[PDB]
Write an enzyme that holds these catalytic residues in place. Structure first.
Site, PDB file in Angstrom:
ATOM      1  N   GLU A   1      -0.511   0.212  -5.357  1.00  0.00           N
ATOM      2  CA  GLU A   1      -1.673   1.141  -5.422  1.00  0.00           C
ATOM      3  C   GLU A   1      -2.214   1.933  -6.761  1.00  0.00           C
ATOM      4  O   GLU A   1      -3.098   1.762  -7.149  1.00  0.00           O
ATOM      5  CB  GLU A   1      -1.630   1.834  -4.295  1.00  0.00           C
TER       6      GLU A   1
ATOM      7  N   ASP B   1       0.732  -1.139  -0.015  1.00  0.00           N
ATOM      8  CA  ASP B   1       0.116   0.010  -0.050  1.00  0.00           C
ATOM      9  C   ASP B   1       0.808   1.262  -0.187  1.00  0.00           C
ATOM     10  O   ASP B   1       2.121   1.081   0.627  1.00  0.00           O
ATOM     11  CB  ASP B   1      -0.835   0.014   1.268  1.00  0.00           C
TER      12      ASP B   1
END
Ligand SMILES: CO[C@H]1O[C@H](CO)[C@H](O)[C@H](O[C@@H]2O[C@H](CO)[C@H](O)[C@H](O)[C@H]2O)[C@H]1NC(C)=O
Ligand code: CA
Ligand code: CA
Ligand code: CA
Ligand code: MN
Length: 1106
Positions: free
Chosen positions: A481, A449
């Protein structure tokens, strides 16, 4: 512009040699590793025609001292000595040029830096590193304006759906100047096309300047313009703050050219031929082969100690999807696989969440999922962490130039960004290795992330390649991401695949050239999302569209998840089983959206092929952007129509893991987003066969119907937005072993039957019903006598302490119970009418209307019994019961799991005796409390805080209060001040204040400010007509105390049996004492922590009375 001229070439001082395969000859300079020109089938492409015998080393111009040796007929080698005393350069590099059939390989095979450099150690002068090597100025291949059909085509990164990243440039004289980085680049004449690959992790900047592994340059030579493609500069020895990076961060420079004639049989030579050939020389992101068969991606979320989605429960969701899709592949990202859940415990990758079943249950999930083609991934973070994490340390934290912390997000706790370059230089790799050692084999992907947004400093092409290599080395596939992240190594981009995120400027890679090349290898593209316009207005190749039903962003819509799979993802994935072979654009259209009116040139026809020479042709039905037909396509397979507009009938010849199906398992999927009959021509191997149709539901293949074949055709007139599957022979649904490993059969009521339960009483009063979110639940209602359902709990360990809960929402005043009989002892817990709505956003039965139980609400809360097995576990039973009542009780999710709490008179089992909660052995959540409505349905900012001295405790970075009061765990509330609402409360199923009995409630607490939080006593359902509460505002615990204060309260149970206690966020403003922002959040002014709760039944005597 006037016709341009430049110096002609005098090669009188040049000695050329040739290397050649059987098909490609390259003329090469003996003085320098330069290709003058290529010949293939009597046609030619120039290379670098004008000598440029210089390289740039650490951005300094060097004239190399070169010696040459032709190694064999295809291969030459150059030793290149590099010296610049003024700039501390003293090195040598060896380069080989090698022809491999129609490819030319450029490799730096050896690099020697004569300066002393030790990877992992301090270097006193970073200028002594050999950090960059650039052969810019020497084109690997080019094309001249004097050649017929001369053209250049290159891709740059664009994530804006309105703006193609591609340039298509005719090579003419005159022409505009060109000196530009590209991700992919091709030159061609009407006879030959070439593409160039490089492992260079160069960047010229962000956006369209990033991932620029190639550089294209116009050079005028005599009366001709050339456009040449160069490798961009390569990286080598690098350091951060004088600490040289590990050896594995060095990758030897490499580039390749491939030269081709017509490769898609269209009798034209252009970049598309180059792109086909380029697949033989390009890097391939690790794990790419799996992508085309992962049809059902989604996220299963855990958060805040709640264990919304235990590992073994995710396996039941996988089985539902396996049935409903008839065996399509799946990819489940476990956001919250670690620590207390999502955004807890970051960096400690090996810390697999204990409350969701730990490494044991994660291993079982991975193993058992294989047969359903369901791959697991985990969400990790390499950019920010919290004090609780084992890897939180002052040395890793990112600081601003002024010395302040680079604070990260604040939610359960206040995060601080880490310095990723520091981390790499100080053992990041070992954290992945620890996870691999603990978890073992079989995990599919790591989703990192945040990475790419710069929170942790440099997250660019070089740094991302290093990170990806660490992850890939453990056997894992890389996912990230951003649409622009990990272009080299990623196989999945969350902002490409979830079409709802970020808007039109933040989607997948808007490049026809790049998608042509790599469509089948990753989900990184522009999918259909009409309101973004441009490339997103009905891409012919589709594009992954991700939805969820297991709690991410509160998503619970199972049926919508499945219909979306079939509306977008089946055909997207179908196309990924082929490689693009031809791409035809139409005429420009005008669109207006997102505040602009702009031109867009759409793809009108895309062709794809496979190794069996199947040919797929996808055609847009109209180029008219204002026609409904612009958003429709036909798809043919070897000329046979498999999609037309709103409907498809598509063959599927691969099992859930992508393996070729046996003939009798070959199938076709039908799906139509509209009502209406459709007619389809069967392929020759179906045309004379019997044909059977099944409606696909969460119960698998249903409503078997033999179809009438007429003239080798079938006609289907079926429900809109409903999947069906067709086979040539009768099919059945397999046994699913629902809830295997969880000690009970079918814990979530997914199997369409109750027959595995032993039912006592009137069985007609117990049924499986669907919630408002289509979640199947056990309902008991309208019973005049007790109704019970019993199963054995199987596979338990002897002499072992356990917890079991069932989710229960009771709309009746009647007793609804969970009872465990171990063979030697019986324990029972019950609830009368439920009184607390469920506010857990990642939990499937929260009170949001669209996943409400009934009447638009949910009171689901976990109802526990605690027990200990004896020596014999052959007859341990679990019974759900409901005494007589008109109204309904709903039950769902029976979870039996090891637990070592000692809450009842210092013993484990449900029983009498003083209640104590030290929070050290919580099964899940915040028992005996449940989260209240202070934040509505939310990823609630109350959770179990974990100790990490000194960082979590008073004094570190000025922290005012301890996260943890005693032991390793407390109950922490972060920043929920001034809300005038209930933070959490007991409920009678968790702790009953018996009618007319009196209890002393004691606990220790920290509070960062005076009277921001209050201990409260209530009864019945809380209403913010606001409920009466007995209110005890609590003072701060640090201005006049060195530790948590102790609080004590007398509570008498109301006669109605529905008394509870809890913590309330008052209307008072908190006091951050002149602090602000991150410091104010970190230091705990706005926080409340509880520990050592005790609730003791007492008899009021003596001074208790006053
Ligand atoms: C500025 O707020 C946005 O970005 C932050 C991170 O900097 C959050 O991700 C936030 O989303 C909120 O996240 C918390 C968990 O951290 C919770 O899941 C909430 O449901 C969610 O709104 C994001 N958007 C906001 C606050 O609207
Ligand atoms: Ca061609
Ligand atoms: Ca269920
Ligand atoms: Ca404790
Ligand atoms: Mn925490």
């Amino acid at each position: 512009m006037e016709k341009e001229t430049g110096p002609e070439v005098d090669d009188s001082k040049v000695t050329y040699d040739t290397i050649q395969s059987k098909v490609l000859k390259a003329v090469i300079d003996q003085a320098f590793p330069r290709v003058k020109e290529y010949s293939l089938n009597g046609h030619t492409l120039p290379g670098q025609v004008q000598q440029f015998n210089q390289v740039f080393i650490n951005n300094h111009r060097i004239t190399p001292e070169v010696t040459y040796k032709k190694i064999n007929e295809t291969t030459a080698e150059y030793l290149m000595k590099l010296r610049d005393d003024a700039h501390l350069i003293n090195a040598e590099m060896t380069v080989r040029l090698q022809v491999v059939d129609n490819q030319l390989h450029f490799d730096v095979t050896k690099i020697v830096n004569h300066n002393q450099v030790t990877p992992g150690q301090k270097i006193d002068d970073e200028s002594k590193l050999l950090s960059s090597i650039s052969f810019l100025g020497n084109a690997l291949v080019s094309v001249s304006s004097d050649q017929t059909g001369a053209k250049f085509d290159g891709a740059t990164m664009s994530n804006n759906t309105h703006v193609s990243g591609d340039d298509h440039i005719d090579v003419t004289n005159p022409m505009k100047d060109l000196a530009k980085g590209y991700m992919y680049g091709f030159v061609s004449t009407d006879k030959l096309a070439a593409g160039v690959w490089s492992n260079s992790q160069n960047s010229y900047g962000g956006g369209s300047n990033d991932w620029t592994r190639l550089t294209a340059y116009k050079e005028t030579v005599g009366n001709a313009n050339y456009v040449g493609i160069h490798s961009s500069e390569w990286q080598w020895e690098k350091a951060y703050k004088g600490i040289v990076f590990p050896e594995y961060t060095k990758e030897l420079p490499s580039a390749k050219v491939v030269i081709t004639e017509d490769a898609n049989a269209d009798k034209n030579v252009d970049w598309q031929d180059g792109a086909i050939a380029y697949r033989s020389i390009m890097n391939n992101p690790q794990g790419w082969e799996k992508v085309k068969d992962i049809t059902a991606y989604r996220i299963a979320m855990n958060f805040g100690s709640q264990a919304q989605n235990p590992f073994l429960m995710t396996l039941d969701g996988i089985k539902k999807i396996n049935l409903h899709t008839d065996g399509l592949g799946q990819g489940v990202l476990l956001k919250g696989y670690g620590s207390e859940g999502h955004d807890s415990g970051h960096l400690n990758y090996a810390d697999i969440g204990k409350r969701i079943g730990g490494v044991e249950d994660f291993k079982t999930l991975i193993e058992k999922a294989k047969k359903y083609g369901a791959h697991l991934g985990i969400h990790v973070n390499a950019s920010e962490t919290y004090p609780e994490s084992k890897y939180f340390n002052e040395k890793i934290l990112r600081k601003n130039p002024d010395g302040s912390y680079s604070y990260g997000w604040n939610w359960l706790d206040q995060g601080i960004n880490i310095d990723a370059a520091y981390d790499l230089a100080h053992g990041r790799l070992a954290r992945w290795e620890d996870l691999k050692k603990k978890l073992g084999d079989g995990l599919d992907f790591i989703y990192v992330d945040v990475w790419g947004n710069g929170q942790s400093g440099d997250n660019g092409a070089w740094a991302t390649h290093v990170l990806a290599k660490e992850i890939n080395k453990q056997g894992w596939r890389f996912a990230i991401e951003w649409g622009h992240g990990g272009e080299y190594d990623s196989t999945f981009h969350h902002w490409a695949a979830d079409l709802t995120y970020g808007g039109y400027t933040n989607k997948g890679i808007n490049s026809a050239i790049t998608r042509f090349i790599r469509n089948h290898q990753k989900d990184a593209w522009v999918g259909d999302y009409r309101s973004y316009g441009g490339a997103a207005n009905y891409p012919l190749l589709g594009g992954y569209s991700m939805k969820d039903f297991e709690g991410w962003q509160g998503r619970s819509d199972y049926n919508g998840y499945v219909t979306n799979l079939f509306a977008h993802d089946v055909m997207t994935k179908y196309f990924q089983h082929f490689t693009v072979s031809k791409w035809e654009n139409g005429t420009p259209v005008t669109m207006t959206d997102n505040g602009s009116t702009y031109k867009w040139t759409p793809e009108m026809r895309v062709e794809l092929v496979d190794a069996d020479n199947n040919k797929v042709v996808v055609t847009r039905k109209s180029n008219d952007v204002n026609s409904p037909q612009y958003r429709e396509r036909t798809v043919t397979l070897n000329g046979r129509v498999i999609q037309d507009g709103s409907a498809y009938l598509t063959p599927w010849n691969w099992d859930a893991n992508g393996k070729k199906l046996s003939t009798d398992k070959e199938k076709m999927y039908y799906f139509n987003t509209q009502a209406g009959a459709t007619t389809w021509t069967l392929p020759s191997d179906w045309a004379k066969s019997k044909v059977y149709l099944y409606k696909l539901t969460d119960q698998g293949k249903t409503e078997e119907q033999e179809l009438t074949v007429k003239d080798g055709k079938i006609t289907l007139d079926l429900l809109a937005n409903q999947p069906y599957v067709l086979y040539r022979s009768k099919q059945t649904n397999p046994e699913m072993s629902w809830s295997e490993g969880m000690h009970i059969y079918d814990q979530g009521f997914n199997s369409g039957t109750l027959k595995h339960w032993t039912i006592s009483g009137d069985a007609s009063k117990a049924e499986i019903v669907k919630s408002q979110g289509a979640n199947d639940m056990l309902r008991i209602q309208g019973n005049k006598e007790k109704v019970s359902l019993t199963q054995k709990l199987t596979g338990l360990k002897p002499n072992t302490k356990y917890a079991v809960y069932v989710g229960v929402d009771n709309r009746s005043n009647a007793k609804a119970s969970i009872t465990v009989n171990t063979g030697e002892k019986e324990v029972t817990t019950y609830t009368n009418k439920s009184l607390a709505l469920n506010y857990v956003k990642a939990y499937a039965h929260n009170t949001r209307r669209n996943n409400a139980t009934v009447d638009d609400t949910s009171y689901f809360q976990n109802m526990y019994a605690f027990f200990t097995t004896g020596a014999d576990v052959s007859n341990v039973t679990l019974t759900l019961s409901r005494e007589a009542g008109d109204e309904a009780t709903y039950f769902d999710e029976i979870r039996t799991f090891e637990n070592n709490s000692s809450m009842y008179g210092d013993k484990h089992d449900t029983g009498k005796g003083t209640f104590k909660q030290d929070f050290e052995n919580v099964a899940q959540g915040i028992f005996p409390f449940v989260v209240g409505g202070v934040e509505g349905v939310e990823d609630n900012r109350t959770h179990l805080s974990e100790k990490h001295d000194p960082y979590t405790q008073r004094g570190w970075n000025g922290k005012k209060v301890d996260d943890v009061i005693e032991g390793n765990w407390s109950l922490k509330t972060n920043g929920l001040v001034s809300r005038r609402n209930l933070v959490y409360q007991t409920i009678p199923q968790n702790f009953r204040f018996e009618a007319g009995k009196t209890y002393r409630v004691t606990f220790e607490y920290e509070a960062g400010s005076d009277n921001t939080y209050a201990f409260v006593v209530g009864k019945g359902e809380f209403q913010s007509q606001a409920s009466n509460l007995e209110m005890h505002e609590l003072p701060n615990t640090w201005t006049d105390s060195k530790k948590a204060k102790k609080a004590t309260f007398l509570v008498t149970g109301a006669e109605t049996g529905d008394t509870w206690v809890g913590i309330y966020s008052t209307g008072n403003a908190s006091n951050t004492r002149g602090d602000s922002g991150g410091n104010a959040n970190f230091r705990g002014y706005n926080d409340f922590m509880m520990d050592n709760l005790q609730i003791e039944e007492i008899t009021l005597t003596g001074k208790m009375l006053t």
